[PDB]
Design a protein around this ligand. Structure first.
Ligand SMILES: *C(=O)NC1CCCCC1
Ligand SMILES: [Cl-]
Ligand SMILES: [Cl-]
Length: 545
């Protein structure tokens, strides 16, 4: 019963196509009137220098806007990362506030950041032809700070994924290798920023969806504490689920860009437009501190075996931090399996997936979601039974199935308390070793297209910090060598289940692809997190600063 959804696809693709044409026509007009502009030099300027030149008058907003608009159009050709051109953004451009900290900066938005007059489909038929009545709060703040949001970027269908394909706009590709995923669900942002088509973007993250795309596409990303920024006006699939919180945050080519973005967002405009966000301004002096850090670290979470490239990235960064004078302390959060199998899965699937499934009624199911929908559709008893059969041979799979069952409000309260007491556990663990920050591996290199949805285990590295609601960011530190990739033939994985087997195959043939580490601080500590990220960036890739 899918013809209605075929109509949605046809209409969505027409709007995407017309958006692209509108963009190109404006780019072609602009270039004719400005034939001598050094567009390469403008595009490769770091955000901090770009901002300064816009503030001084050295570069016109128009010059910067249309150049990035040109570049976004071009990189889209090989990645399919842009779903929509934000129609009024040229008239926004001419009205941008001069004193704004982001005056004249083109910014790209993940499709779920509602923008007036435009759909936030999430790749779902039922959200097509349902344009937002207004800009969401962070989009309002961006504009009040002088920025110019200019495109919506692609997401995997429903966002419940770390790949990036849906049936309306299709499949987004990694800009480093087109057989590879850009990661997700902020994958359009990853591909666009990662190929130079936007200097700053916003994404969201409930199990790693800022961090996967950033890592897979070789850019920086930060997932703040859930309630550091406003979620007001965000489009979603499931509403009212508060056990594992959603976070939104910046993506960019460097760390300084992330810190600029958070500084611009954490202002009175935000705090008055959404009073439910604690009014905590950006603390520059914590961000800029150069005091030695106590850095906890691990090479593996003992759940998802790291690739050789991940492991090399982690050890090398550790050794450089030591040489720079920081104290590196072996540290692994306790009971990760519990945090993932019981707390995180149970938090996301407390209703057995029912609320989530209503979004898919009458719709196609994108191949990049794997068997997720099929598995969620199954009866609560046949899940339970299959869980008991799989437990001897495949304990991970069994635990997954058993913890995605529907349960009562009573049981949800108990789960919510366990999440709270686990949070306090890890905090106490952290304080007993007197850590400032924590260094971890990050999933990478980029997986093959249509494999993330079959490698669910691999979310272990990022999902843990959604469960704990700790700020976490990722920084590119190296690229896959011939040796790293060859050494994947010796990868086994701790479990030997289908998730380990898919991941092994998924990560092969990745020579030249970027690989990241993850940086973590305690709740409300975004500034310390970024300081630390800045340090990693400086030591492993000094040409960024
Ligand atoms: C981004 O946060 N992606 C997550 C992948 C695991 C399931 C929830 C969504
Ligand atoms: Cl039909
Ligand atoms: Cl709060």
């Amino acid at each position: 019963g899918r013809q209605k959804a075929r109509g949605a696809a046809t209409r969505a693709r027409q709007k995407q196509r017309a958006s692209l044409e509108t963009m190109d026509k404006a780019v072609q007009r602009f270039r004719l009137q400005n034939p001598d502009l050094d567009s390469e030099a403008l595009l490769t300027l770091p955000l901090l220098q770009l901002v300064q030149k816009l503030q001084s008058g050295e570069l016109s907003p128009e010059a910067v806007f249309f150049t990035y608009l040109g570049k976004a159009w071009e990189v889209n050709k090989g990645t399919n990362c842009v779903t929509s051109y934000l129609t009024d953004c040229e008239t926004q451009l001419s009205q941008a506030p001069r004193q704004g900290l982001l005056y004249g900066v083109p910014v790209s938005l993940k499709e779920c950041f509602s923008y007036k007059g435009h759909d936030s489909t999430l790749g779902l038929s039922l959200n097509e032809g349902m344009p937002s009545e207004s800009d969401c709060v962070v989009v309002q703040v961006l504009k009040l700070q002088g920025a110019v949001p200019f495109v919506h970027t692609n997401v995997p269908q429903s966002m419940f994924s770390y790949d990036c394909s849906n049936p309306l706009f299709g499949q987004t590709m990694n800009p480093w290798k087109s057989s590879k995923s850009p990661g997700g669900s902020s994958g359009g942002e990853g591909a666009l920023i990662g190929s130079g088509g936007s200097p700053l973007g916003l994404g969201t993250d409930i199990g790693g969806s800022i961090r996967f795309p950033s890592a897979f596409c070789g850019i920086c990303g930060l997932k703040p504490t859930g309630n550091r920024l406003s979620k007001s006006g965000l489009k979603g699939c499931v509403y009212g689920q508060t056990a594992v919180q959603l976070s939104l945050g910046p993506m960019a080519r460097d760390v300084e860009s992330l810190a600029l973005c958070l500084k611009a967002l954490l202002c009175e405009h935000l705090f008055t437009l959404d009073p439910t966000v604690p009014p905590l301004p950006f603390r520059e002096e914590v961000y800029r501190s150069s005091r030695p850090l106590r850095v906890g670290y691990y090479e593996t979470d003992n759940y998802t075996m790291p690739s050789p490239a991940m492991r090399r990235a982690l050890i090398e960064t550790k050794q450089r931090l030591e040489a720079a004078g920081h104290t590196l302390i072996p540290f692994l959060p306790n009971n990760i399996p519990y945090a993932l199998e019981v707390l995180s899965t149970g938090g996301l699937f407390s209703d057995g997936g029912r609320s989530f499934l209503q979004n898919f009624k009458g719709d196609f199911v994108d191949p990049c979601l794997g068997d997720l929908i099929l598995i969620l559709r199954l009866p609560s008893w046949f899940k339970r039974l299959l869980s008991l059969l799989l437990k001897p041979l495949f304990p991970r799979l069994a635990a997954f199935l058993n913890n995605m069952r529907p349960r009562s409000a009573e049981k949800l309260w108990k789960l919510q308390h366990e999440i709270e007491m686990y949070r306090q556990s890890v905090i106490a663990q952290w304080k007993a070793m007197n850590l400032d920050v924590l260094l971890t591996p990050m999933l990478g290199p980029a997986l093959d297209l249509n494999t993330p949805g079959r490698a669910t285990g691999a979310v272990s590295y990022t999902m843990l910090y959604n469960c704990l609601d700790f700020p976490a960011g990722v920084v590119p530190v190296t690229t896959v060598t011939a040796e790293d990739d060859a050494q994947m033939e010796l990868y086994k994985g701790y479990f030997g289940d289908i998730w380990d087997i898919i991941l092994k195959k998924a990560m092969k043939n990745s020579v030249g692809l970027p690989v990241a580490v993850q940086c973590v601080a305690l709740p409300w500590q975004e500034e310390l997190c970024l300081r630390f990220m800045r340090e990693v960036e400086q030591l492993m890739t000094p040409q960024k600063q």
